[PDB]
Amino acid sequence: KVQIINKKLDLSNVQSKCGSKDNIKHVPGGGSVQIVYKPVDLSKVTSKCGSLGNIHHKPGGGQVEVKSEKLDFKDRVQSKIGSLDNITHVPNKKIETHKLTFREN
Amino acid sequence: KVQIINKKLDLSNVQSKCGSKDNIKHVPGGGSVQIVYKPVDLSKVTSKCGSLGNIHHKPGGGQVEVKSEKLDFKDRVQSKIGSLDNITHVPNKKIETHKLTFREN
Amino acid sequence: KVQIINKKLDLSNVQSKCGSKDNIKHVPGGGSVQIVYKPVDLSKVTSKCGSLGNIHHKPGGGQVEVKSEKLDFKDRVQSKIGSLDNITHVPNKKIETHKLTFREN
Amino acid sequence: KVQIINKKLDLSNVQSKCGSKDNIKHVPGGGSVQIVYKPVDLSKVTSKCGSLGNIHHKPGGGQVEVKSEKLDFKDRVQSKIGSLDNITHVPNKKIETHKLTFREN
Amino acid sequence: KVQIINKKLDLSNVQSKCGSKDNIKHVPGGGSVQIVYKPVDLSKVTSKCGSLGNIHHKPGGGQVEVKSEKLDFKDRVQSKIGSLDNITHVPNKKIETHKLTFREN
Amino acid sequence: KVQIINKKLDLSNVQSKCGSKDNIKHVPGGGSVQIVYKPVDLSKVTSKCGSLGNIHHKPGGGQVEVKSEKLDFKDRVQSKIGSLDNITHVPNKKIETHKLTFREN
Amino acid sequence: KVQIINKKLDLSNVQSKCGSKDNIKHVPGGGSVQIVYKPVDLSKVTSKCGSLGNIHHKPGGGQVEVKSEKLDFKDRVQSKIGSLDNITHVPNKKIETHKLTFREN
Amino acid sequence: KVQIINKKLDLSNVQSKCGSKDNIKHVPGGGSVQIVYKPVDLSKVTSKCGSLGNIHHKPGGGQVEVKSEKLDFKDRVQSKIGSLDNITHVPNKKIETHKLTFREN
Amino acid sequence: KVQIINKKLDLSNVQSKCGSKDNIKHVPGGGSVQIVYKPVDLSKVTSKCGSLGNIHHKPGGGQVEVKSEKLDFKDRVQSKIGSLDNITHVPNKKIETHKLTFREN
Amino acid sequence: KVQIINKKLDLSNVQSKCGSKDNIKHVPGGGSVQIVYKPVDLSKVTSKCGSLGNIHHKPGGGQVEVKSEKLDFKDRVQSKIGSLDNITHVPNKKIETHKLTFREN
């Protein structure tokens, strides 16, 4: 007689490759700065303000400061570099199936 | 006669590769700074303010400070580098199935 | 006659690789700073303010400070490096199934 | 005649690899600082404020301070390094099934 | 005639590898600082404020301080290093099933 | 009858004021050189070579050497001078007779 | 009858003021050199080579050497001078007769 | 009848003021050199080589050496001087007769 | 009848003021050198080589050496000087007769 | 009848003021060297080589050596000086007759 079917299928952030594999090198003679900045951030915020009130959704952010007032090198700065990576690879199947299936009804 | 079917299927952050595998090297002669900044952050916040009130959702954030007022090198800074990574690999199947299946009804 | 089916299937943060395997090296001659900053953070916050009141959801954050007022090197800073990693690998199947299945009804 | 089925299936943080296996080395000549900062944090907070009151959910955060007012090196700082890791591996199946199954009804 | 089935299946933090196996080395010539900071923290807080009152949920956080006012090296700081890890491995199956199954009804 | 008068009157270097009275000041900030060079030399050489032979009259002379191969000032050289000689003379007969007389016969 | 008068009057270096009265001051901030060089030398050499032979009249001379190979000032050289000579003379007859007289016969 | 008068009057270096009265001051901040060099030398050499032979009249001379190979000042060199000579003379007859007289015959 | 008068009057170095009265001060902060060099030398050499032979008249001379190979000041060298000579003279006849007289015959 | 008068009047180094009265002060902070070098030398050498032979007149000379191979000051060298000579003279006849007289015959 009477039927009500409600299939509210919510879905987010699925099978999502966000990671970052990375060889990072840093060879300075003098005083340098390297900043690698990769905050992988996944979120799902739901804010329902049904009557009076407040939603102060204030997540903090990244803050990277490098301050240096005085900095001296009163003589020679040398850096004699032969090599860094002497890799001798003398010898690949990556079947990366990311499957999803909704065979409904 | 009467039937009410409610399939509220919520789903988030599934099969999500967020990790970061990374060779990190740092070879300075003088006084340097390296900052690798990767906060992997996964969240799901639900804030329902039904009557009067407040939702002060204030998560703290990352704060990385490197302060250095005075810094001197009153003579020579040398760095004679031959090599760093002498890898000699003398000899791969990565079947990474990420499967999901809802065979409903 | 009368039936009410409510399948509220909530699900979050499933099969999620967030770990970070990483060779980290640090070879300075002089006085340097390395900061590797990876707080893996998984959360699920549910704040329901039904009548008057407050929700002061204030989680603390990371705070990394390196302060150094005076710092001197009144003579030579040398660093003669031959090698770091002399790896000689002289000889892989990673079947990483991440399966999920809801065969409902 | 009358039936009410409520399958409130809540689920979070399942099969989630968050650990971080990592060779960490630190070979300075002079006075350096290395900070590896990985707080793996998993949480599930539920705060229901039904009538008047307060929810002062204030978890503490990490605080790493390295302060050093005066620091001197009044003569030579040398570091002659031959090698660090002389690994000679002269000879893998990682079937990492992460299975989950809800065959309901 | 009348039946009420309530299957409130709550579940959290299951099969979650959070441990971190890591070779950590620290070979300085002069006076250095290494801080490895990995508080693995798993929590599940439920705070229901039904009438008037307070919920001062204030867990303490980590606090690592290294303070050093004056620090001197009035002559030479040498560190002649041959090797650290001379590993000679001259010769693996890790079937890590993380299974979960709800065959209900 | 017979008379021979021989008045061989030799005379040299008589009543000769050769001295040098002198206020000498030297106020440098950085590395300077002052050389005041006043050899007062009075001589009377009589060399009679009557038959064969040699007269190797070789008096040595003054030799003032200031050699400086490397010389550095790697920071500031200041010299704030108020005064040097604050002489307040609040109060002369120099009858310098240099007489010579040969009242002969 | 017969008379021979021989008045061989030799005379040298008589009443000769050669002395040198002198206020000498030396106020350096950094590394300086002052050389005051006043050899007062009076001589009377008589060399008669009557037959064969040699007269190797070789008097030594002054030799002042200031050698300095390496010399550094790796920080500030200040010299704040108020005064040197605060002489307050609040009150002369120099009858310098240099007489010579040969009243012969 | 016969007379021979020989008045060989030799005379040298008579009434000769050669002395040197001198206030000498030396106030350095850093490493300086002052050399005051006043050899007062009076001589009268008579060398008669009547037959074969040698006259190796070789008097030694002054030799002042200041050698300094390495010399460092790795921090500040200050010299705050108020005064040196605060002489307050609050009150002269120098009848310097240098007489010589040959009233012969 | 016969007379021979020989008045060989030799004379040298008579009434000769060669002394040197001198206030000498030396106030260094760092490592300095002062050399005051005043050899008062009076001589009268008579060398008669009548037949074969040698006259090796070799008087030694002054030799002042200040050698210093390495010399360091690895921190501050201060010298705060108020005064040196605070002389307060609150009150001269120098009748210096240098007489010589040959009233012969 | 016959007369021979021989008045060989030799004379040297008479009434000769060679002494040196001198206030000498030496106030160093660090390691200094003061050398006051005044050999008052009076001589009268008579060398008559009548037949074959040798006159090896070799008087030794002064030899002042200050050798210092290594010398360090690894911290502060201060010298706060108020005064040295606080002389308060609150009140001269020097009749220095140097007479010589040959009233011969």
Swiss-Prot record, chains A, B, C, D, E, F, G, H, I, J:
Site note Not glycated, residues: K1, K17, K21, K25, K38, K44, K48, K58, K67, K70, K94, K99
Localization, UniProt: Cytoplasm, Cytosol; Cell membrane; Cytoplasm, Cytoskeleton; Cell projection, Axon
Top-rank taxon, per record: Eukaryota
Record PTM text: Phosphorylation at serine and threonine residues in S-P or T-P motifs by proline-directed protein kinases (PDPK1, CDK1, CDK5, GSK3, MAPK) (only 2-3 sites per protein in interphase, seven-fold increase in mitosis, and in the form associated with paired helical filaments (PHF-tau)), and at serine residues in K-X-G-S motifs by MAP/microtubule affinity-regulating kinase (MARK1, MARK2, MARK3 or MARK4), causing detachment from microtubules, and their disassembly. Phosphorylation decreases with age. Polyubiquitinated. Requires functional TRAF6 and may provoke SQSTM1-dependent degradation by the proteasome. PHF-tau can be modified by three different forms of polyubiquitination. 'Lys-48'-linked polyubiquitination is the major form, 'Lys-6'-linked and 'Lys-11'-linked polyubiquitination also occur.
Expressed in which tissues: Expressed in neurons. Isoform PNS-tau is expressed in the peripheral nervous system while the others are expressed in the central nervous system.
Positions of disulphide bridges: C18-C49
Modified residues (Phosphoserine): S12, S20, S32, S51, S79, S83
UniProt repeat feature Tau/MAP, residue ranges: 2-32, 33-63, 64-92
Modified residues (Deamidated asparagine): N6
Effect ascribed to mutating N23H: In FTD1; reduced the ability of tau to promote microtubule assembly without having a significant effect on tau filament formation; effects at both the RNA and the protein level
Domain-level remarks: The tau/MAP repeat binds to tubulin. Type I isoforms contain 3 repeats while type II isoforms contain 4 repeats.
Oligomer status and interactors: Interacts with MARK1, MARK2, MARK3 and MARK4. Interacts with PSMC2 through SQSTM1. Interacts with SQSTM1 when polyubiquitinated. Interacts with FKBP4. Binds to CSNK1D. Interacts with SGK1. Interacts with PIN1. Interacts with LRRK2. Interacts with LRP1, leading to endocytosis; this interaction is reduced in the presence of LRPAP1/RAP.
Disease: In Alzheimer disease, the neuronal cytoskeleton in the brain is progressively disrupted and replaced by tangles of paired helical filaments (PHF) and straight filaments, mainly composed of hyperphosphorylated forms of TAU (PHF-TAU or AD P-TAU). O-GlcNAcylation is greatly reduced in Alzheimer disease brain cerebral cortex leading to an increase in TAU/MAPT phosphorylations.
Name of the molecule in the record: Microtubule-associated protein tau
Organism in which the protein naturally occurs: Homo sapiens (Human)
Residues of the full protein shown: 591 to 698 of 758
